[PDB]
Structures are given as structure tokens and as C-alpha cells.
Design a protein around this ligand. Structure first.
Ligand code: RET
Ligand code: NA
Ligand code: NA
Ligand code: NA
Length: 137
């Protein structure tokens, strides 16, 4: 597959519930959920090397990783973590995350290119799964 491109959101589910289980107060959540409903995503992939930029009106993240190599990033709520991405299947990556400090919900994410040309991002905290679906811009 090639994830490379600019991606636009077409569906979001369960992002408020995800932030809820992470313990974000309703007021800050409200700012976040609205902004996260319109994220713009740029991916540059060369083989196992990835750059992913996710931009919203309230927060932008930029990560560089290589599939199979540990790296440091932040959880969806900004907590520093170490992460490892692997290919779960041909067009699907899964990232497992461990907090650098302290105790917290177990978090992960997955990104998959689907047969129809879309991209599915999932983000999980404990049991709660957020799904966001994108199409190329
Ligand atoms: C403003 C703000 C937040 C916003 C988070 C957002 C907007 C996350 C968007 C995530 C997306 C689009 C992920 C795609 O991979 C936090 C950190 C929850 C709480 C602190 C204040
Ligand atoms: Na990430
Ligand atoms: Na994020
Ligand atoms: Na999944």
C-alpha cells in the first residue's frame, strides 16, 4: 500500500467517549471534540518510514516513525508515551503505546487502507474505540 497523501475526514465516531474515558473535563472536551471533527491529515510514507501530520484548529501533531522501531510520541490527550508500530496485515498498521511516567488507560491506534480507497484510523483507550474515516483530498 501507499498511505502517502492528503486526507479529509468523512466520518467520526466515539471521539467524545474516548476523551471521556481519558478523564478530560466536559469543558475542555467540548473544545476538543468540535475541533477533532475536522482534522486535516498529511502522510508521507517511504516503505516503512512514515511522517504523519494531523492538524486541527486547536492542536497539530507531527510524528516521524519507522514501522518496527520504538519511538516517543504523545497519547491523544498529550501524555508522553513510547510507541511501537507493526504491520498487522498488508494494509494495516497497529501502534501499541506505553506511558513514560505513571499509570493510565492502555492506549493504541490503528491505521488501515481499505479496499475502497479510504483510510480508517482507530484510537483505543481501555475498552473504548474511536473510529475516524478519511478519503483522499
Ligand atoms: C485542545 C485540547 C485537546 C485536543 C485534542 C485534539 C483536538 C485531538 C485530536 C485528535 C485527532 C484528530 C487525532 C487523529 O489522529 C486535548 C489534548 C484533548 C486536551 C487539551 C486541550
Ligand atoms: Na499518533
Ligand atoms: Na492525535
Ligand atoms: Na481496529
Amino acid at each position: 500500500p501507499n498511505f502517502s497523501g492528503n486526507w479529509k475526514i468523512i466520518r467520526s465516531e466515539n471521539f467524545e467517549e474516548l476523551l471521556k474515558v481519558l478523564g478530560v473535563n466536559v469543558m475542555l472536551r467540548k473544545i476538543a471534540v468540535a475541533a477533532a471533527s475536522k482534522p486535516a491529515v498529511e502522510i508521507k510514507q517511504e516503505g516503512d518510514t512514515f511522517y504523519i501530520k494531523t492538524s486541527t484548529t486547536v492542536r497539530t501533531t507531527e510524528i516521524n516513525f519507522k514501522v518496527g522501531e520504538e519511538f516517543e510520541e504523545q497519547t491523544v490527550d498529550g501524555r508522553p508515551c513510547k510507541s511501537l508500530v507493526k504491520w498487522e496485515s498488508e494494509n494495516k498498521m497497529v501502534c501499541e503505546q506505553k506511558l513514560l511516567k505513571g499509570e493510565g488507560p492502555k492506549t493504541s491506534w490503528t491505521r488501515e487502507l481499505t479496499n475502497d480507497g479510504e483510510l480508517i484510523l482507530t484510537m483505543t483507550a481501555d475498552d473504548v474505540v474511536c473510529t475516524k474515516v478519511f478519503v483522499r483530498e
